[PDB]
Amino acid sequence: QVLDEQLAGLAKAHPSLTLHQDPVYVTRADAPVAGKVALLSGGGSGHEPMHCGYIGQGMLSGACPGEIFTSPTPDKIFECAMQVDGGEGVLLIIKNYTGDILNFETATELLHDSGVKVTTVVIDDDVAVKDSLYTAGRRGVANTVLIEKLVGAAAERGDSLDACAELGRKLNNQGHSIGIALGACLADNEMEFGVGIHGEPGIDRRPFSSLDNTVDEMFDTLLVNGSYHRTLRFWDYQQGSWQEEQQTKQPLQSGDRVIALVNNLGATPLSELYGVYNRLTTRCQQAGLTIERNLIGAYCTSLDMTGFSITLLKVDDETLALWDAPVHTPALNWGK
Amino acid sequence: QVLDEQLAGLAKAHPSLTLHQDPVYVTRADAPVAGKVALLSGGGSGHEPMHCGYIGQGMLSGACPGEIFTSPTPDKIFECAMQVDGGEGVLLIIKNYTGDILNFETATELLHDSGVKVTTVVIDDDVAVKDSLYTAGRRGVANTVLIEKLVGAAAERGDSLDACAELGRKLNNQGHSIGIALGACLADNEMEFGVGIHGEPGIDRRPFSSLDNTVDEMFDTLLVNGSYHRTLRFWDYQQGSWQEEQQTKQPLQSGDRVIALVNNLGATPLSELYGVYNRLTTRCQQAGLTIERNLIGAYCTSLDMTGFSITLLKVDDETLALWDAPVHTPALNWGK
């Protein structure tokens, strides 16, 4: 089994991780870490390094990979949460797709039913399409990575479960993303504009004119599609029930400070990602947006799809301190 | 110019780097760093993050990008070396290609003539083909990155130019690489076995059967093509002339301890690189090689080429201490 080989390789490459069997999931080798909120996510394989490459100090306590483009089953999520539970609650970060919501939600009830204090954060940052093929609402994409790092820092320093969940939900309302593909994981000199990470169709198919013109269209879309009101359920562990919470996003606007993530969906050369970043800085400055930090590289992929995405997350001084806090994972490492 | 936009993006993204103009090159923002040997390299654009992503403490003091797949001209190299010179000499790391050798050797003499103490290290780790399209001898590839890090740590530690140079030439004799491409940056389910990073032909074209079988073939080639005797010229700064030096490589052998670099040439999904690493660990273990450290990711690319390379570098306790030493660059970051 290739997936089995790939996971064994990740485990052999990183002594800081433990690969479990029956069922399969990955955790920090030092989990459970007593006294800290434990953070978990998971999803289909085919988006590496999301999420296994984000397991470590300052970030995920563990992750549950599923088959290609498919959510892990609830037993994987449950056993992973039980393995990392440090007695202070487990926070599950779930990307907004039909399968992920159903499995993580089922795992959440089984955990609660077993005495574990748990709650959830749903990520729906992709501004391109509402109600795509596998999603009720907006798709969860690359901002998931920024949220895991920020909430990961909050949990690592000792914040409460409620404080980490509140932070995750707030960041979710403040992060906006859009991706384009020039080829699948076609048309010829055409791109799928607003493509999804499982290959879902975008807003439309259009002609690729230039890299700069493409960034302009992506950026303009992030500005005009920012406003959004919808319901996201979360687990209320006190009542033992799902809570339907109306959530609101404001569009990005002049005066906002952001963290920018220019993300390779798979086969985009790093040189091109820098050209993308260059044009993005110009557009942000014209629009009155201040980029305070950036991440440029392959952080949330779609197999070998040829394309990239842009994510802009509004932040403040407190959030920027959580960004700068230490993180030690396979994909992200700083002691800043 | 797209190339101009990319370097501007790199500069905007990393305040720790300074992009110079007239001529163009990049240095650490804090260069010249007084009292330490300065380390420099360069080469064609299209291999990002090599070499600009390796500029920083514990690694390169600066780098000189050229046009796509083309060596930087001598003026860039000379001006960059003058900018980073910390009073202890500048060490030039040069990959073995006709253009790089010519232009870096020319800069070396101009430097010497202007009073800068300089010497050189030539990299020829590709075991696949002798005398390819743009190389006299063996091609310089991914081991260049491992050498930059190791000699980078030594320079940062305060070793002399001679010491850094001798270490670089020693590592060069102990590091072995090979790459394959499934597609350029061509046939149906065929691979170019022993491909060059500029797209130079390999040993042959052959059918891709499986990931594990491809790794087996690449690994076997590293084991059997290891033996190598050749002349590599280096600048003797005391005599002010090029010294022809016979250099010898021993094949990798049972009992050797190694650092493994599994490197994306362009569009290989990270999940697959982990599959590669899984198979590589098995083969090393069977052959009596102990992998002590690894790097898995996009470190020395070829535009968007579809393929990957494997590098094995023999090391000892002292070299491992230089590996573990701190490094702070865009592409590689770890602390004590």
UniProtKB/Swiss-Prot annotation, chains A, B:
<dbReference type="GO" id="GO:0046365">
    <property type="term" value="P:monosaccharide catabolic process"/>
</dbReference>
<dbReference type="GO" id="GO:0005829">
    <property type="term" value="C:cytosol"/>
</dbReference>
<dbReference type="InterPro" id="IPR050861">
    <property type="entry name" value="Dihydroxyacetone_Kinase"/>
</dbReference>
<keyword id="KW-0808">Transferase</keyword>
<comment type="subunit">
    <text>Homodimer. The dihydroxyacetone kinase complex is composed of a homodimer of DhaM, a homodimer of DhaK and the subunit DhaL. DhaL also forms a complex with DhaR.</text>
</comment>
<feature type="domain" description="DhaK">
    <location>
        <begin position="1"/>
        <end position="332"/>
    </location>
</feature>
<feature type="binding site">
    <location>
        <position position="95"/>
    </location>
    <ligand>
        <name>dihydroxyacetone</name>
    </ligand>
</feature>
<feature type="active site" description="Tele-hemiaminal-histidine intermediate">
    <location>
        <position position="198"/>
    </location>
</feature>
<dbReference type="GO" id="GO:0061610">
    <property type="term" value="P:glycerol to glycerone phosphate metabolic process"/>
</dbReference>
<comment type="pathway">
    <text>Polyol metabolism; glycerol degradation.</text>
</comment>
<dbReference type="GO" id="GO:0019563">
    <property type="term" value="P:glycerol catabolic process"/>
</dbReference>
<feature type="binding site">
    <location>
        <position position="100"/>
    </location>
    <ligand>
        <name>dihydroxyacetone</name>
    </ligand>
</feature>
<dbReference type="GO" id="GO:0046835">
    <property type="term" value="P:carbohydrate phosphorylation"/>
</dbReference>
<dbReference type="GO" id="GO:0042182">
    <property type="term" value="P:ketone catabolic process"/>
</dbReference>
<dbReference type="GO" id="GO:0006090">
    <property type="term" value="P:pyruvate metabolic process"/>
</dbReference>
<keyword id="KW-0319">Glycerol metabolism</keyword>
<dbReference type="GO" id="GO:0047324">
    <property type="term" value="F:phosphoenolpyruvate-glycerone phosphotransferase activity"/>
</dbReference>
<dbReference type="GO" id="GO:0042802">
    <property type="term" value="F:identical protein binding"/>
</dbReference>
<dbReference type="GO" id="GO:0006974">
    <property type="term" value="P:DNA damage response"/>
</dbReference>
<dbReference type="GO" id="GO:1990234">
    <property type="term" value="C:transferase complex"/>
</dbReference>
<protein>
    <recommendedName>
        <fullName>PEP-dependent dihydroxyacetone kinase, dihydroxyacetone-binding subunit DhaK</fullName>
        <ecNumber>2.7.1.121</ecNumber>
    </recommendedName>
</protein>
<dbReference type="GO" id="GO:0042803">
    <property type="term" value="F:protein homodimerization activity"/>
</dbReference>
<dbReference type="Pfam" id="PF02733">
    <property type="entry name" value="Dak1"/>
</dbReference>
<dbReference type="InterPro" id="IPR004006">
    <property type="entry name" value="DhaK_dom"/>
</dbReference>
<feature type="active site" description="Proton acceptor">
    <location>
        <position position="47"/>
    </location>
</feature>
<dbReference type="InterPro" id="IPR012736">
    <property type="entry name" value="DhaK_1"/>
</dbReference>
<comment type="function">
    <text>Dihydroxyacetone binding subunit of the dihydroxyacetone kinase, which is responsible for the phosphoenolpyruvate (PEP)-dependent phosphorylation of dihydroxyacetone via a phosphoryl group transfer from DhaL-ATP. Binds covalently dihydroxyacetone in hemiaminal linkage. DhaK also acts as corepressor of the transcription activator DhaR by binding to the sensor domain of DhaR. In the presence of dihydroxyacetone, DhaL-ADP displaces DhaK and stimulates DhaR activity. In the absence of dihydroxyacetone, DhaL-ADP is converted by the PTS to DhaL-ATP, which does not bind to DhaR.</text>
</comment>
<dbReference type="GO" id="GO:0004371">
    <property type="term" value="F:glycerone kinase activity"/>
</dbReference>
<feature type="binding site">
    <location>
        <begin position="44"/>
        <end position="47"/>
    </location>
    <ligand>
        <name>dihydroxyacetone</name>
    </ligand>
</feature>
<keyword id="KW-0418">Kinase</keyword>
